[PDB]
Enzyme design. Structure first.
Site, PDB file in Angstrom:
ATOM      1  CD  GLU A  41       3.820  16.159  27.166  1.00 60.05           C
ATOM      2  OE1 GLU A  41       3.941  14.732  27.019  1.00 60.05           O
ATOM      3  OE2 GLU A  41       5.092  16.952  27.738  1.00 60.05           O
TER       4      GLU A  41
ATOM      5  CD  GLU B 128       3.030  19.857  29.748  1.00 55.49           C
ATOM      6  OE1 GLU B 128       3.992  18.480  30.019  1.00 55.49           O
ATOM      7  OE2 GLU B 128       2.227  19.414  29.249  1.00 55.49           O
TER       8      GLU B 128
END
Length: 314
Positions: free
Chosen positions: A143, A255
């Site tokens: 991320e 995710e």
């Protein structure tokens, strides 16, 4: 058992070895509620064909270090599950609010940092190779919406970010020439996030094979955002189309997650997203009980067993 090809129906189960040590048990979601090892359970009861594992460099408690990753990767391999290795380039959680390089790397020149990052990636992949595991995908960062190893790899330092990224890419390719290298951001609903990062890489010769996204859309329901979680998912679908067209790169949802007690909605989320132009979807830590670690509530298990959420995968 043999590995599947095609769509990746994935689970990140990085926590699993810690959970096992802590004495957590998992059970079949059927009339028998039989105790079972978690990866086997996910494969046989939740249609999972792929495992994702985070890597931390020098973690306090050893968890997510190379040694831990090897154990879990070998287990996945044994069970005929494909593997994604996710390098955080940190000693702890790497997310958009915390991209802190390993303590041991902080005094390094930029040239030595690139070498340290390269050597870590090669160390981990080489060990995997040695024990008979070739991952199919590897994340260079986790991320990294603002960049990585801030401030050195901040998006505001686009040449440095791109050079660190490329050090990662080259390292993966060195050991695993066929592994698809993923640059993974959060907020898969936000085109701007992706435009910023991928225009930066484009402008600087940044190397990558695949665009990774996180999709956790429930906040939009909780906060009363018009359109709810569904608009967040549709915005993500549009983003997927957008980045494919602009960059001509495939997309992975690295995710996905909803509250553990939103089993039906979560099922519909996954079913919906599985038709988008993506190569797979990885549920993040599905097996984590409600309340785990800091109070984590986006698992998809209840009473130590899968809810209907991953029926989408069966």
């Amino acid at each position: 058992v043999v590995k599947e090809e095609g769509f990746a129906r994935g689970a990140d189960v990085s926590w699993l070895t810690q959970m096992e040590a802590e004495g957590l048990k998992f059970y079949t979601p059927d009339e028998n509620r039989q105790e079972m090892e978690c990866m086997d359970l996910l494969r046989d009861y939740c249609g999972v064909n792929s495992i994702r594992l985070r890597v931390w460099v020098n973690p306090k408690d050893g968890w997510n270090n190379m040694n831990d990753v090897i154990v879990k990767a070998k287990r996945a391999e044994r069970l005929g599950l494909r593997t994604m290795i996710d390098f955080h380039f940190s000693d702890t959680w790497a997310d958009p609010g915390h991209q802190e390089m390993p303590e041991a790397w902080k005094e390094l020149s930029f040239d030595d940092l690139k070498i340290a990052l390269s050597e870590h990636v090669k160390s981990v992949l080489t060990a995997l190779k040695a024990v008979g595991v070739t991952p199919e995908w590897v994340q260079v960062g986790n991320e990294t919406t603002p960049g990585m190893m801030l401030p050195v790899g901040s998006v505001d330092n686009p040449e440095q970010l791109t050079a660190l990224n490329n050090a990662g890419y080259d390292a993966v390719k060195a050991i695993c020439p066929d592994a698809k290298v993923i640059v993974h951001l959060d907020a898969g609903n936000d085109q701007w996030v992706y435009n910023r990062m991928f225009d930066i890489l484009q402008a600087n010769g940044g190397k990558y094979d695949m665009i990774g996204m996180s999709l956790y859309p429930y906040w939009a329901e909780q906060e009363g955002k018009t359109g709810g979680w569904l608009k967040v998912a549709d915005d993500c679908i549009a983003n997927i189309k957008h980045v494919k067209q602009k960059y001509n790169k495939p997309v992975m949802i690295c995710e996905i997650g909803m509250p553990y007690d939103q089993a039906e909605a979560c099922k519909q989320l996954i079913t919906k997203m599985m038709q988008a132009d993506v190569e797979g979807i990885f549920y993040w830590e599905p097996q984590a009980p409600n309340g785990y670690n800091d109070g984590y509530n986006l698992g998809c298990f209840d009473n130590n067993a899968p809810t209907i959420a991953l029926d989408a995968f069966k």
